[PDB]
Amino acid sequence: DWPVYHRIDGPIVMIGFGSIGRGTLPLIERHFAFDRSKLVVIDPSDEARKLAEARGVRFIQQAVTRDNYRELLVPLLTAGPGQGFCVNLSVDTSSLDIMELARENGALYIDTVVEPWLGFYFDPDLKPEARSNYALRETVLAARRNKPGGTTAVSCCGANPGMVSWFVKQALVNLAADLGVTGEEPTTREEWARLAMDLGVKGIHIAERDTQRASFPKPFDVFVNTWSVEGFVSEGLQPAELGWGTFERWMPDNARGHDSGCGAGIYLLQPGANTRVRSWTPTAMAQYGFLVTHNESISIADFLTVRDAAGQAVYRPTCHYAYHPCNDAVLSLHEMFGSGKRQSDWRILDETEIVDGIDELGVLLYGHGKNAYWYGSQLSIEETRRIAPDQNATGLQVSSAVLAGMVWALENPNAGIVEADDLDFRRCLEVQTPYLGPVVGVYTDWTPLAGRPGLFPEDIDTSDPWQFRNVLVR
Amino acid sequence: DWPVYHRIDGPIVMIGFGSIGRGTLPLIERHFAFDRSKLVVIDPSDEARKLAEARGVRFIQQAVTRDNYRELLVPLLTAGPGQGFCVNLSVDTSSLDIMELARENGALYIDTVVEPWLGFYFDPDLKPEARSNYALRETVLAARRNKPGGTTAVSCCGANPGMVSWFVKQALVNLAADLGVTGEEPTTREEWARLAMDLGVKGIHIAERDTQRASFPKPFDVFVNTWSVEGFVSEGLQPAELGWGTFERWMPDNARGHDSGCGAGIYLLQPGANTRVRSWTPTAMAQYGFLVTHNESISIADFLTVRDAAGQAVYRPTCHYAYHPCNDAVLSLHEMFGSGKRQSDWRILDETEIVDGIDELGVLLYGHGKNAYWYGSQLSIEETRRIAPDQNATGLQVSSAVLAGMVWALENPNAGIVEADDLDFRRCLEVQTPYLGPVVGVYTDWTPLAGRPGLFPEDIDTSDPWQFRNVLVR
Numbered sequence: 001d002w003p004v005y006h007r008i009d010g011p012i013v014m015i016g017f018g019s020i021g022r023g024t025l026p027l028i029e030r031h032f033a034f035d036r037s038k039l040v041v042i043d044p045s046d047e048a049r050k051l052a053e054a055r056g057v058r059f060i061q062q063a064v065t066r067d068n069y070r071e072l073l074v075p076l077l078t079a080g081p082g083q084g085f086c087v088n089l090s091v092d093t094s095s096l097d098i099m100e101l102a103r104e105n106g107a108l109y110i111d112t113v114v115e116p117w118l119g120f121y122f123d124p125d126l127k128p129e130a131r132s133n134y135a136l137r138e139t140v141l142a143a144r145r146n147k148p149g150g151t152t153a154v155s156c157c158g159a160n161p162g163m164v165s166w167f168v169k170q171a172l173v174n175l176a177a178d179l180g181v182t183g184e185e186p187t188t189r190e191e192w193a194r195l196a197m198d199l200g201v202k203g204i205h206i207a208e209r210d211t212q213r214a215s216f217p218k219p220f221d222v223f224v225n226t227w228s229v230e231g232f233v234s235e236g237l238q239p240a241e242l243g244w245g246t247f248e249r250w251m252p253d254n255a256r257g258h259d260s261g262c263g264a265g266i267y268l269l270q271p272g273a274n275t276r277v278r279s280w281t282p283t284a285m286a287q288y289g290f291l292v293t294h295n296e297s298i299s300i301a302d303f304l305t306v307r308d309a310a311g312q313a314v315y316r317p318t319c320h321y322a323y324h325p326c327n328d329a330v331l332s333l334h335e336m337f338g339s340g341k342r343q344s345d346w347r348i349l350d351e352t353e354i355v356d357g358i359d360e361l362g363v364l365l366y367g368h369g370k371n372a373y374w375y376g377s378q379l380s381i382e383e384t385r386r387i388a389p390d391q392n393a394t395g396l397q398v399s400s401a402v403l404a405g406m407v408w409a410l411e412n413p414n415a416g417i418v419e420a421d422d423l424d425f426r427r428c429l430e431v432q433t434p435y436l437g438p439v440v441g442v443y444t445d446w447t448p449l450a451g452r453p454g455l456f457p458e459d460i461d462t463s464d465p466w467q468f469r470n471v472l473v474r
Numbered sequence: 475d476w477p478v479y480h481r482i483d484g485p486i487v488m489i490g491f492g493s494i495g496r497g498t499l500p501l502i503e504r505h506f507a508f509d510r511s512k513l514v515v516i517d518p519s520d521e522a523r524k525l526a527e528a529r530g531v532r533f534i535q536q537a538v539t540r541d542n543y544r545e546l547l548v549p550l551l552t553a554g555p556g557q558g559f560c561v562n563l564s565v566d567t568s569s570l571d572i573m574e575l576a577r578e579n580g581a582l583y584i585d586t587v588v589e590p591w592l593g594f595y596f597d598p599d600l601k602p603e604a605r606s607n608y609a610l611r612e613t614v615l616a617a618r619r620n621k622p623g624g625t626t627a628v629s630c631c632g633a634n635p636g637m638v639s640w641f642v643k644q645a646l647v648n649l650a651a652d653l654g655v656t657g658e659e660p661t662t663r664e665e666w667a668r669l670a671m672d673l674g675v676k677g678i679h680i681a682e683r684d685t686q687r688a689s690f691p692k693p694f695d696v697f698v699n700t701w702s703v704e705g706f707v708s709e710g711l712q713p714a715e716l717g718w719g720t721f722e723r724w725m726p727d728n729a730r731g732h733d734s735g736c737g738a739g740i741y742l743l744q745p746g747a748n749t750r751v752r753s754w755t756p757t758a759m760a761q762y763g764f765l766v767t768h769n770e771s772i773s774i775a776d777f778l779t780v781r782d783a784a785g786q787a788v789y790r791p792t793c794h795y796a797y798h799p800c801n802d803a804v805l806s807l808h809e810m811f812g813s814g815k816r817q818s819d820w821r822i823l824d825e826t827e828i829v830d831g832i833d834e835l836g837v838l839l840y841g842h843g844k845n846a847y848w849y850g851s852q853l854s855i856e857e858t859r860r861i862a863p864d865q866n867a868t869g870l871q872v873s874s875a876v877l878a879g880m881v882w883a884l885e886n887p888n889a890g891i892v893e894a895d896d897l898d899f900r901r902c903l904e905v906q907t908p909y910l911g912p913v914v915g916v917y918t919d920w921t922p923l924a925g926r927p928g929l930f931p932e933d934i935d936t937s938d939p940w941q942f943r944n945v946l947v948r
């Protein structure tokens with residue numbers, strides 16, 4: 001039967017009960033020991049309230065805001081007898097501020113995104129740079145520098161960001177092994193970074209194809225998705241963003257860097273969900289992905305940076321999302337950008353509404369001796385239904401990653417603010433793998449120059465197929 | 475009961491029996507008197523053969539080619555008694571060569587496209603300019619100059635090109651009435667061009683939204699459309715192309731003109747089916763269309779050109795396609811361009827497969843005192859099934875236009891080579907309108923600058939919303 005990993009000795013406060021909350025709650029109940037009355041869910045939605053009442057869980061129907069979060073969360077997280085756990089799966093709330101509050105009060109914390117308080121994403125007085133995930137991530141890095149160590153808080157530990165950081169480490173180990181390179185696997189950041197450099201990894205796509213289909217066709221003027229519509233549109237409207245490799249020799253005219261921070265990122269002055277890149281997955285083969293900004297695009301490139309004695313970067317991989325969402329979400333983006341405004345309505349596909357499909361989610365390492373290697377999960381909706389309730393394949397990859405992060409935080413409770421790249425990737429994947437369906441590594445000889453140039457002139461670099469110049473759809 | 479317009483006493487030679495041929499044959503049998511035995515269908519496919527045999531129509535299973543078309547077609551065209559009619563609804567055949575052969579033998583001719591002999595659309599030695607619909611149309615204009623008058627041959631008389639020319643004339647008439655512009659209805663090309671100028675029509679979109687949906691979801695690696703997949707992909711991979719208005723102040727860097735010809739066009743060094751434009755239809759409201767090359771983009775702009783004494787163009791409207799095909803076709807394009815190659819299979823949706831939807835097809839006249847005016851057909855699949863067999867709503871708009879052109883040609887059989895713009899639009903709409911469902915004119919305050927600029931800097935022209943600079947998706 002199911003492993004019980006740990007006792008939680010205090011309140012469990014779940015903030016948000018949308019698609020990921022609904023998928024995560026049963027895993028928390030499944031895999032942790034605690035008094036049922038210790039758990040409470042906070043969400044402003046009536047829909048969420050009715051579901052929570054049906055599950056028999058405590059529910060507080062309230063939006064967490066800048067104005068009320070201290071008054072609301074501090075008593076709940078410190079109810080005792082010991083250390084509680086704040087599980088933040090919301091939108092419109094500040095990850096940074098709630099995280100800092102949890103840490104001040106000795107409660108563990110996990111989220112799946114660096115979310116700002118409501119109002120941030122569409123503030124007209126904000127420059128595009130300030131709306132970037134690079135900038136949000138830097139607030140977390142600064143918080144860590146200001147308060148090193150202390151109670152563990154896990155930032156951005158979903159499927160992506162989150163799990164895919166663990167896939168990158170496993171992929172690097174697999175590439176090395178497949179070359180006949182034997183020896184101790186890296187243990188430090190510097191060793192991982194040098195492994196990527198030594199293997200000649202030029203860059204990484206977070207290469208995803210969602211093939212989940214609904215029993216009903218896409219309705220006119222309804223945005224459809226397999227996870228948060230609000231969250232997807234939000235990130236989709238942020239600037240296109242990528243971790244920027246040292247091998248790159250070209251960037252578009254509307255690309256910009258950053259004055260400060262870890263130094264690993266650029267962004268484009270255009271929305272990521274209307275930016276296309278040429279990419280590849282085992283089931284899709286060659287496909288367009290959208291260049292949607294993601295925390296791990298920066299965090300992985302940062303993690304895998306090799307610096308010289310002077311502190312200058314001598315190696316860093318390119319890293320970015322290449323997202324092909326479900327067909328109805330592709331159509332939803334076409335409708336939204338085509339109308340110049342958000343649809344009147346939206347819906348997230350429930351498992352009962354999905355006829356078939358998978359969420360194929362992995363990391364595509366390219367530029368090395370075997371050209372390209374994809375490593376990740378091919379979780380189907382059929383398998384999902386067999387092993388976890390109240391979610392689709394997309395949800396389960398995320399909720400199981402939150403599970404793994406919670407297990408790691410409980411096992412390593414004095415580690416301070418950490419990213420998915422900081423966790424024991426083997427332990428996390430050990431906890432998560434029961435919920436990931438097939439997990440496979442696949443080589444391909446495909447490159448962004450396959451079939452090019454065609455019948456029109458193209459600005460391409462034939463000496464280096466994986467240059468962003470060739471990947472970006474222009 | 476249905477009107478029988480004329481008796482056809484000679485052979486009726488239908489070249490091609492795909493989606494449009496299948497929809498047109500029943501209309502021909504319905505609306506003309508002739509012995510069924512004088513009908514002959516020529517198509518290389520087994521599928522076409524089985525369908526023709528089921529209809530009891532003579533069938534020749536041959537591909538018409540540059541090598542055989544004279545030997546194959548001349549005896550069919552001249553079998554008598556009296557004048558034959560060549561109804562050309564094929565792919566991979568030269569419209570020009572077959573047209574000249576019909577004329578040389580005294581047979582009437584109609585088609586729905588200026589198609590080249592097989593090999594042209596992907597000939598690697600052709601310059602982009604030579605692959606343009608402008609260049610193909612010039613071969614027809616040259617033929618007309620070379621042999622003025624003579625037997626009627628109707629070039630490009632489907633739904634679009636074809637019907638939309640008649641919609642432009644009716645729209646201009648409606649606009650004049652609404653804008654209070656006085657004068658007699660134009661009766662010459664020169665008078666039409668002057669009316670468009672006097673109304674201040676800056677440009678015209680062929681503004682289409684197809685909402686037909688199938689009872690099955692789009693299959694992976696299958697291109698799905700409501701009409702010719704081969705024909706759609708061929709034109710989609712031709713350069714983006716537009717009739718170019720005198721009001722335009724900007725063209726993109728990869729835009730090019732023509733050294734010779736009528737002078738009304740430009741093209742872009744990129745495929746039209748992967749080129750988006752901001753447009754509008756009554757059912758879609760604001761939407762993306764694809765800037766797919768079309769004969770009427772050039773023919774309508776050329777037709778509405780006003781010249782001074784020197785022969786210099788002083789007024790010309792912009793004119794181009796702004797096509798939003800059915801959702802499964804939108805997905806098919808994303809798949810094809812994302813993979814960089816055609817799908818391994820394709821299918822055209824049958825009326826028996828379509829669960830609902832319309833083919834909303836009209837002309838959007840803009841820049842005048844009432845901003846924009848859309849005029850056209852909103853034909854539904856439900857209505858289509860009630861009034862015509864063996865076709866969906868897209869098919870019926872095309873087949874009924876072919877019917878109209880055939881009636882016109884019989885009533886005007888010595889008019890020489892003509893385009894849809896040369897036909898009497900009232901007579902043609904009188905024949906076609908019973909098959910068009912609701913035909914409506916709608917005004918809108920929408921412009922391409924609606925909601926712009928937004929979150930990111932945009933290269934827009936704020937002085938004139940309808941500039942191509944604002945329409946083209948960059």
Ligand SMILES: NC(=O)c1ccc[n+]([C@@H]2O[C@H](COP(=O)([O-])OP(=O)(O)OC[C@H]3O[C@@H](n4cnc5c(N)ncnc54)[C@H](O)[C@@H]3O)[C@@H](O)[C@H]2O)c1
Nearest residue numbers: 016018019020045063064090091112158159160161228231
């Ligand atoms: N790392 C990853 O892989 C990953 C994957 C999916 C989702 N996410 C993130 O997880 C979060 C949730 O995703 P989802 O699919 O569950 O979203 P969702 O849209 O389905 O649900 C969001 C929930 O948050 C609630 N909410 C809104 N304002 C709130 C407030 N002030 N306080 C508390 N709750 C509030 C809503 O009522 C809703 O029920 C999002 O922020 C999303 O970006 C991360």
Ligand SMILES: NC(=O)c1ccc[n+]([C@@H]2O[C@H](COP(=O)([O-])OP(=O)(O)OC[C@H]3O[C@@H](n4cnc5c(N)ncnc54)[C@H](O)[C@@H]3O)[C@@H](O)[C@H]2O)c1
Nearest residue numbers: 490491492493494537538564565586632633634635702705
């Ligand atoms: N103006 C318009 O509005 C409009 C609209 C639709 C279609 N069209 C055009 O009309 C034509 C037909 O469209 P469709 O939907 O019927 O196409 P389709 O693909 O369904 O059918 C094309 C037919 O042509 C046949 N064919 C191929 N090679 C041939 C040859 N060498 N000789 C004779 N026949 C041959 C095929 O076997 C097939 O049955 C296409 O060229 C298309 O572009 C125009």
